[PDB]
Write a protein that binds this ligand. Sequence first.
Ligand SMILES: Nc1nc2c(ncn2[C@@H]2O[C@H](CO)[C@@H](OP(=O)(O)O)[C@H]2O)c(=O)[nH]1
Ligand SMILES: [Ca+2]
Length: 104
Amino acid sequence: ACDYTCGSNCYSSSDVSTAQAAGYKLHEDGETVGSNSYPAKYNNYEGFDFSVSSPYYEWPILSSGDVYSGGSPGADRVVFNENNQLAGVITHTGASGNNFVECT
Ligand SMILES: Nc1nc2c(ncn2[C@@H]2O[C@H](CO)[C@@H](OP(=O)(O)O)[C@H]2O)c(=O)[nH]1
Ligand SMILES: [Ca+2]
């Protein structure tokens, strides 16, 4: 079974941790990758009810299993905070415009 389901993509908690670990490391080094400069500040315009405190940062999680290294970010994101705590996994899939919905 999927721990997180983003549209058609299936993710296990181990997939999330690997992606999150990579994103946070770049965050610590103040470096970014990709045209959208990830990891990027996530403002939570959606108003998701995360149990961890902000600031939040979004980092692409890929259905392929590989860690994001530039190129197309796809539609899924892992959101983590400054304390490297997972806030949630969200996606553009099934969301209006450039908005996000949480993965189930
Ligand atoms: N929907 C949404 N986009 C955000 C938020 N914070 C930052 N963004 C960024 O603004 C951009 C335009 O909505 C998004 O780019 P993306 O569409 O390439 O992922 C996303 O990275 C937020 O809280 N909600
Ligand atoms: Ca996997």
